[PDB]
Amino acid sequence: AREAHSQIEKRRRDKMNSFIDELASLVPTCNAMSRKLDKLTVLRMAVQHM
Amino acid sequence: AKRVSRNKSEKKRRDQFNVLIKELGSMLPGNARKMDKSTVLQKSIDFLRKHKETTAQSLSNEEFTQLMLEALDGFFLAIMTDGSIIYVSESVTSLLEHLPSDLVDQSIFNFIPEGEHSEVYKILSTHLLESDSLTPEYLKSKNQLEFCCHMLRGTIDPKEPSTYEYVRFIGNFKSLTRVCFVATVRLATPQFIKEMCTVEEPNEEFTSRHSLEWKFLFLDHRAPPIIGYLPFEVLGTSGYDYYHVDDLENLAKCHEHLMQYGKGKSCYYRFLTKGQQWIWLQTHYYITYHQWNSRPEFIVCTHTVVSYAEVRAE
Amino acid sequence: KRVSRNKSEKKRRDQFNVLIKELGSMLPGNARKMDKSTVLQKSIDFLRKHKETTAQS
Amino acid sequence: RYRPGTVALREIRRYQKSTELLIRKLPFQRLVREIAQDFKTDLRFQSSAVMALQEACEAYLVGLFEDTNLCAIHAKRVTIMPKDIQLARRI
Amino acid sequence: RYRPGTVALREIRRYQKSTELLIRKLPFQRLVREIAQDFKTDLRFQSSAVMALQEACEAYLVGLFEDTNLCAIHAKRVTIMPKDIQLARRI
Amino acid sequence: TRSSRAGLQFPVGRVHRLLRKGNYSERVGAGAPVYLAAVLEYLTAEILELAGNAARDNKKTRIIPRHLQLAIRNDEELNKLLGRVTIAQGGVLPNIQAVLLPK
Amino acid sequence: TRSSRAGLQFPVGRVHRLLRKGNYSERVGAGAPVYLAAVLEYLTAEILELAGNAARDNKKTRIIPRHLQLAIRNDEELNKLLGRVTIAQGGVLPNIQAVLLPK
Amino acid sequence: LRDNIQGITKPAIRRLARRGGVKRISGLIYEETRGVLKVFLENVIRDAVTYTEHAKRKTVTAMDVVYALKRQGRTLYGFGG
Amino acid sequence: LRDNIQGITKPAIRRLARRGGVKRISGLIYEETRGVLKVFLENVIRDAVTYTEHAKRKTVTAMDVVYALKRQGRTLYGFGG
Amino acid sequence: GRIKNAREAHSQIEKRRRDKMNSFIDELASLVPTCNAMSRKLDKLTVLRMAVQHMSDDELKHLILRAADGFLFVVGCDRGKILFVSESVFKILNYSQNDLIGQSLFDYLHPKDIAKVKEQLSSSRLCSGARRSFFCRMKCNRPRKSFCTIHSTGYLKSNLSCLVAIGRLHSHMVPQPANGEIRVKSMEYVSRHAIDGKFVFVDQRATAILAYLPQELLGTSCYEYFHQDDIGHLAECHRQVLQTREKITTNCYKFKIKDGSFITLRSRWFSFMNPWTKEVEYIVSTNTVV
Amino acid sequence: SYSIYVYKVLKQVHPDTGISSKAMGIMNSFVNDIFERIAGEASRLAHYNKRSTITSREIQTAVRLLLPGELAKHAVSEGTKAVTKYTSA
Amino acid sequence: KESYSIYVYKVLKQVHPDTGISSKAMGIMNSFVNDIFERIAGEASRLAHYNKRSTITSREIQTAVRLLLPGELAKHAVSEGTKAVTKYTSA
DNA sequence: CCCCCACCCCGACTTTGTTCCTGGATCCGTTATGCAACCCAAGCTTCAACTCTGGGTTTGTAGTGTGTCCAGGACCTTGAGGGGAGAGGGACTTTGAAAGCCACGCCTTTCCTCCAGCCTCACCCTTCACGTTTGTGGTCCACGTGC
DNA sequence: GCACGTGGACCACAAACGTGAAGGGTGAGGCTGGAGGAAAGGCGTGGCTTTCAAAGTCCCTCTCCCCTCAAGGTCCTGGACACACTACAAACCCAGAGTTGAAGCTTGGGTTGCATAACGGATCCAGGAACAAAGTCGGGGTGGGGG
């Protein structure tokens, strides 16, 4: 059971990575940046864009 | 530029450390060069200790003090009850033409007229007081005193008859590890123009060029900081417009000697700054020639500021 | 060392959470207790709709 | 007239065989004294010095013209241009 | 592939920016000894002397190359030819 | 030292000895060494000044042969005085003829 | 006579004196002026021979600066040794490039 | 005086160029030649005048011209020395 | 010792030409350059060896190279003087 | 082996060096309250910053303040606004600190002195070059006497450049005359005149002695102020001094002043000659109060 | 060698800078080169005038001949000032 | 004052007895002799200095000659100076 | 290929310069003394020579594409060639006196000598600057697991 | 699901490290400077007379000026190929190391040497006379172009 829960946690962290990249796609600055950004930087840019 | 960039950053770390070491060492007392960085830190350690101890057991006031002393036409003076002088401010030389070394350790009554000695002796000797452990002497009304007297002037030629100035002492009696009196001495006759007697820098200089009519053809960037006039304010004007009355004749003699020899060194003289101070100078001169016939074209003048002690010595 | 890694990790998670909360706070029809992924999805939709509606105003 | 170039070749032969000065003397003297006055006035000049200057100048100029001719030839030209002189001097 | 000449411009900038010796020192040293033996065999050299020789040679050649380049430019040409070297040397 | 009496940095005694050697003349007038030392010091000052400017323009604190070459080839009068002179690791000015530029 | 000892025309005494003048050195070995005089005489003979040959080619019996110019500029070794000398009334070699000739 | 540089006439320059084997000449040459010659003369004259001045004389002698040319790297025989 | 003239590589010549601002090089240059260098260097070597010989030495010193360059109008700084 | 050994002693002397330096960095930190209060090993760089940040006078302050006279003021050069003034100004101008601070000196100045003060406020341990000194008329709260003549002396100082100066209201009368027993220096003022006697240069002592400010004398003739009873004598002295280099001293004479009265003066005159041109530059005079 | 004086001069011109040993050797070579030029030219001038002594006149003339006019003016001024200060004291 | 006209003329009669020389050509020759003398003397002086020698000997001259003269001329001049010094030393 | 025109060199006559003869000297040469510059024999240690091993940046050789060099046609305008006219140059002659040269007398400038003593140079010790690695830790993250 | 943990990633600091560059100190003696004197170089005065300046005049070459017309410079166009650019392979250059001793360099000994000076002397230099060469003008022969 714990493996299934941990892999649901992986599904969650994957969903979050995917939505962080999608949110980045809606932020011009993030959409323009080259390096694989660290999560906090993406979210800071997102709250700055809104 | 990858590793050039990392090396730039590391050399910058190096630089920042060096800058901080230099700043740290610059503020110390008894400053000197050739100290190793460890010695710089050790002297900073010692200085922090000493300064913290002395302060704990205790616009700038220096600029205010200078400004007020000058405006009042005055100087600090301190003397023992026996009449012996113990300290004096340098401004005394500009006001009375005595050097501090001519005053210190000497009797004040050598400069006060003999017909007034009894009065100042009474002033100094009649007052006696012992302070408590709580109140500084200068703050007690009993120690404050205001009085007036005449004082002798110095001179460049001892043949001049004795000349004096009336002054007011404003000061207080203070004890020293004997009892002295220390006062701001103000001249009763105001002195709206005065001579600078000590050079505020170890050496300072400025250069110019002059025509065969002695009119300014050039003034360097160092003059305005010294004399207060910008180049355009002097160009075309005669150098004589800025020299002191008594020195006009000696400077004419110097320029005649220069016309005689083409090069040389001048006598001492005074120059009136835009700030209304006569500054003592000495100048080196030489002349340049028009190749077509080897006759003069312009004079070059290198002016050096000098002290009243060197003036009075020769 | 481990205490400092714990501190920096909690700081990382706290910064992330503060940013998630600020991001979600600007949304229309706001409601608390939304899952992080739901916060981001609603933020994605809100950015799309707000940008389009404002641009075409 | 003869076709241009032929008479020039005859002139070239003449002046290469010859040795006399090709410049006018008195204009040269006046030009010298005109220049010299700028360095110093009231100057006096030996005719030997004048002749030395004339010879040196013609020699220098002819050498420079030879180099200029080489440059023009290199540029596939018969006619020399100021650029040829500038280049030769620079080299 | 970059276009002919573009890399040459980057090279020109590089080599003008640098100051290092461009000839390989051992070939140069053996060439020196190959020449020197003709005048005297069993002859030694201070390495510094060899370096001075190499630096003088590279400087001299670089100057001659620059002059030759001016010649080619005068001929309105980019590729330098032995004619250009010969003309420069003659001048 | 005569140099001190002249306010000069260079060793006037050495200069006088060197002029007295080398067989440049039978005698040396006493003012000649001073004059020459002044000239040398002046040229040295000019050169070092230009060199330090070049170094600072490239953010360097140490003068290297490249700086001397740059200074000397940039300065027209020094380039005249030293036109035929060569300097170790001197390099060249970044001169490029316009015809060579691509467009 | 020293010149006679060496079998030479040129004056050894004058050469020796000239070497003691000019401050060329503190001392001068006795054989030095002899060697120098021999070299000078040899070079002089070369020049005069070539100049006389030029004069004869020009059907002349007295040397003039024109002859010296032609001779020195025709002899490659002397031409290299004296390339930068100018000769009063020397003229130039009759050189014309083939490209300039009519065709 | 002045303007004696134009005294270097176009035919004189033609003769000189012809001695240099020059078959054809562009008009621009003449002024350029005058300028070059002016520079050359100015240099030589400056040096000769300097020699004369150091000798404290007022008369220019051919020996000064020769010394000037010598130090300029160009040697002229047949004017003494 | 043989063929060391070939030791002067075509890339070395190219680099020197680039330092000389040269953009394009004809192949004949490589051999032409080798010849010119051989001449120049041989003359310098002859002079330096002549200095060494007069000094009755068996080792060439940089000062001899300096003198050889100096007298050929190639004054060089960096090796004393 | 010998090379490696020589490198050990040297490299460990360098170790001794960095140990000494780190010890002294830590000691210096101990002497900085903030660094000593900080728990963590502060890096050498931050430690040095904090150290440089971390790195009788009142007797003198009273000794000079008790002797003070006039009023101190600070006026911005770019501003003309009085940035500060001492309370003693209320004794002098009768305006208070609050009436002066935050307001511009130039309305308190007389209209013809505003230009002069502006020229003085132009830029070019207080150094003689930055020094400035001028007489001017300043308004008073109670009034022709709506203005009083103030001597202002100060220096220029820096973000907003300003003149720091003392303004003193000197008595134009001469109190406490000299005792006959004592040789005392009388008040004096120097002036220079064109051939016709028109002022071409004058000093501030002339303003203290004559009440006329410098611009009020420059461009005017001395004969506009000489008293007619002495103009004959003074004109004789003038005619004589034009012919000789010798210094001629006049008799005592009367000279008119701004308020309309006369004062007694005695003057020493000479015609100075420039040696380069062999020409008289101008008449030079030192006037003396009798 | 002149390294001491070269260094001191730099410390008067650019106190915040140092010198590579190669640059210092270059300066020594340059000093000796210029010394040789001037001394030889002055020797010739003395000979051209059959003089036995080299003075500041000969050096001034050799400087005017050797240096371009700009540098010549400044160098002549420097020699003049140096000789003036020395002789005057 | 001194010139080499005597020896120039005697040498001319050695090489071309039938031939004379003009004073202009004689001046050319005297200038040449003096020039070569100066070249050799200066080079020999430098040589002696470079070797901290106070004396100029035939070795210094031979070396200066080898340095100054082209190859063929150098061989002949060296042989001539050798013969002259040999005979002079024998005599 | 032949004839005509122009240029280049030679020949003749007149004036100036050079060579040969004459007298006086001092430049050249000899023989002598002197102090020492330099050669020579010898020993001691160094730097250069000579060699090797290992690494790898530079060099060599090869393949392909095109920018450059060259040839070519063709315009059109610039220089050349000549004619013809006019002017300052060139040659030769003259005079004026200024400047360079010379000789005479005085003196003071610098070489030469010896000494004194300290600044510049060499070595030795020590320190700092630097890159540069590394240590070292912190910031932070990716996603595990635990709670 | 979130928070914390650990491993991992990444950043940047922080320190020491040793190496390379530099500077400070002490030894130390060479070299600078000063005193003292001698006598040689130079300044100074007084005079002359040689050379260039400056000009006049006539004859004349050379320069000024104008026009025509073909040739040379130039522009524009097209071809191909010699050169540059990429690639892999190789090597010898570079770096670092070791090993050997010929030559560099110093010391001491002794000599042969060249300078210097006095003195001898005769070939050279200034000057006087005669002959040949140089300058100027005219004629003849050779070289090239045009028909």
Author numbering:
A (entry chain P): 80 to 129
B (entry chain M): 34 to 91, 105 to 223, 248 to 384
C (entry chain O): 35 to 91
D (entry chain E), E (entry chain A): 40 to 130
F (entry chain G), G (entry chain C): 16 to 118
H (entry chain F), I (entry chain B): 22 to 102
J (entry chain N): 75 to 129, 150 to 218, 245 to 263, 282 to 296, 316 to 447
K (entry chain H): 36 to 124
Article excerpt on this structure:
The 3.8-Å structure of the endogenous Por sequence (NCPPor) accommodates two CLOCK-BMAL1 protomers engaging the nucleosomal ends from SHL+5.0 to SHL+6.5 in line with end-binding behaviour. The two bHLH DNA-binding domains are angled around 40° from one another. The more internal CLOCK-BMAL1 molecule (E-box 1) (local resolution 4–8 Å) superimposes well with the CLOCK-BMAL1 structure at SHL+5.8 in the W601 backbone. Consistent with its binding preferences in SeEN-seq, CLOCK-BMAL1 enforces a solvent-exposed register of E-box 1 in the Por backbone. We observe that the two CLOCK-BMAL1 protomers engage in extensive interactions with one another and the histone core, mediated by the PAS domains. CLOCK at E-box 1 forms well-defined interactions with the histone core, with the HI loop of the CLOCK PAS-B contacting the H3α1 L1 elbow, sterically occluding the acidic patch. The BMAL1 face of the internal heterodimer (E-box 1) mediates interactions with the external heterodimer (E-box 2). The F-α PAS-A helix of BMAL1 (residues 206–213) is central to tandem PAS–PAS interactions between CLOCK-BMAL1 protomers. On the basis of XL-MS and map interpretation, we provide a tentative model for E-box 2 with the PAS domains residing on top of but not interacting with the histone core. The Por structure, with its tandem arrangement, thus identifies cooperative protein–protein interactions between two CLOCK-BMAL1 protomers as a further strategy to engage chromatinized E-boxes.
